[PDB]
Amino acid sequence: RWLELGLTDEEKQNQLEQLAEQYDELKHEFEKKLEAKRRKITQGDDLAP
């Protein structure tokens, strides 16, 4: 829960930021897939006129 620290910013914090950005992108993609599956399995089905 403490992925974020600070030491020798010039490159260490750069790599840590790249990693945190990749993590945020991964979480966003997972949430997108989650909501897509949700709205797909919860959308109103057509039955008959």
Binding site: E17, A20, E21, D24, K27, H28, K32
Partner: protein, 417 residues
């Protein structure tokens, strides 16, 4: 690419840039989606994108970073922020954020934040170790605000009168009681010019609620400050939204040890918006007013204070009277014993074209001893004793006529003896 750069550009320059990019006709649609589409293109082929604004937390957990030039409005210009930032840097409602953004991917329409570069013009590391707002220890006015420029033009004298009628300092609550057609607009304009000229270090903000768009336009390009306003062609939702956002921005900024001074005109229109947006709680007052409809305006007005630990927040809200409604009187009566700096503008003097029409006898400031020296405050007392037995119009006549020849206020005090 910076967002504020395209922001300070007029619409014609955005049109020219979009036509230089060779796209579909962009001049046809909103400035909002104009900037949106040109940013989408230039970010399809361009660097990292940069942006800045103020953050508002939604009830879904995520947040929206909006611009003050759009008066913090919802639209394609906004920057989406995830709750993961609000857990990592523990973001807050009203934080001045500036950082890197990117285009939205498949199915998304809001630009996503990449890395916070400046949080309230400060370090995110230093954004943790901060002090809470109401957890602060308020204090009386300690440092006085110098409004006298020293040049003595046609309008500067107006400010000088204030300097001898009701001195203001950082952390003081100012309330202006004036009927319609009394000249309060350029009163605030001259005050803002003077406090922006004398103190370029404190961030200065104004607020216009239910105001005409002409004054909004002429103000947003004449004085310094993020001139945010709320025109009457929008419902109370937008007005209370501006209230929330700018009051939270000021709160965060004083929490960051900065002196913020907020100019509101008028507080009665904002309170009316609060009343018409808040649900009815059963208790009605005279004129269709809710008892709970004044709670949030009272919060907004009392947010200003002088912090001991650092920074300060001074509010100057104007109040309307003598306009006939029930709400104006009930609100002004509710707010009378709240502010510690009354400025009364009598229309009885404005009808004679004697500007500024200031009720010096009915005006004053409590705890004014902590703003001026002993002899300054003594001269103020002697002059108040001299001018008090006089009427209203003749009082301002003598004041303005004697401040016309002498040019510095202490010289006026000297010559008054």
């Amino acid at each position: 690419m910076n967002l504020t750069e395209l922001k300070n550009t007029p619409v014609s320059e955005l049109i020219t840039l979009g036509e230089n990019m060779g796209l579909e006709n962009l001049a046809r649609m909103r400035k909002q989606d104009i900037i949106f589409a040109i940013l989408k293109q230039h970010a399809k082929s361009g660097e990292d994108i940069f942006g800045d604004g103020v953050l508002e937390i939604l009830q879904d957990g995520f947040g929206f970073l909006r611009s003050a030039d759009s008066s913090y409005l919802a639209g394609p210009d906004d920057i989406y922020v995830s709750p993961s930032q609000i857990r990592r840097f523990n973001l807050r409602t009203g934080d001045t954020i500036s950082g890197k953004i990117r285009p939205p991917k498949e199915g998304e329409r809001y630009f996503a934040l990449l890395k916070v570069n400046e949080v309230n013009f400060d370090k995110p590391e230093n954004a943790r170790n901060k002090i809470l707002f109401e957890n602060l220890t308020p204090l009386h006015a300690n440092s006085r605000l110098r409004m006298e420029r020293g040049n003595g033009s046609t309008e500067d004298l107006t400010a000088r009168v204030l300097d001898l009628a009701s001195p203001i300092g950082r952390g003081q609550r100012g309330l202006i009681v004036a009927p319609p057609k009394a000249g309060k607009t350029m009163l605030l304009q001259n005050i803002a010019q003077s406090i922006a000229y004398n103190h370029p270090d404190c961030v200065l903000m104004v607020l216009l609620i239910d105001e005409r768009p002409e004054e909004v336009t002429e103000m947003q390009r004449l004085v310094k400050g993020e001139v945010v306003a709320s025109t009457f062609d929008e419902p109370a939702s937008r007005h209370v939204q501006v209230a929330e956002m700018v009051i939270e921005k000021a709160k965060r900024l004083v929490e960051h040890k900065k002196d913020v001074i907020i100019l509101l005109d008028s507080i009665t229109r904002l309170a009316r918006a609060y009343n018409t947006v808040v649900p009815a709680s059963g208790k009605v007052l005279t004129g269709g007013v809710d008892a709970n409809a004044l709670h949030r305006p009272k919060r907004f007005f009392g947010a200003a204070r002088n912090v001991e630990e650092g920074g300060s927040l001074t509010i100057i809200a104007t109040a309307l009277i003598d306009t006939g409604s029930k709400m104006d009187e009930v609100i002004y009566e509710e707010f009378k014993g709240t502010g510690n700096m009354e400025l009364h503008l009598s229309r009885k003097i404005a009808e004679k074209r004697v500007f500024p029409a200031i009720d010096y006898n009915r005006s004053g400031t409590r705890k004014e001893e902590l703003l001026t020296t002993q002899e300054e405050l003594q001269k103020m007392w002697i002059l108040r004793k001299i001018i008090h037995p006089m009427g209203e119009i003749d009082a301002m006549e003598f004041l303005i006529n004697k401040l016309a020849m002498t040019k510095t206020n202490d010289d006026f005090f000297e010559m008054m003896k």
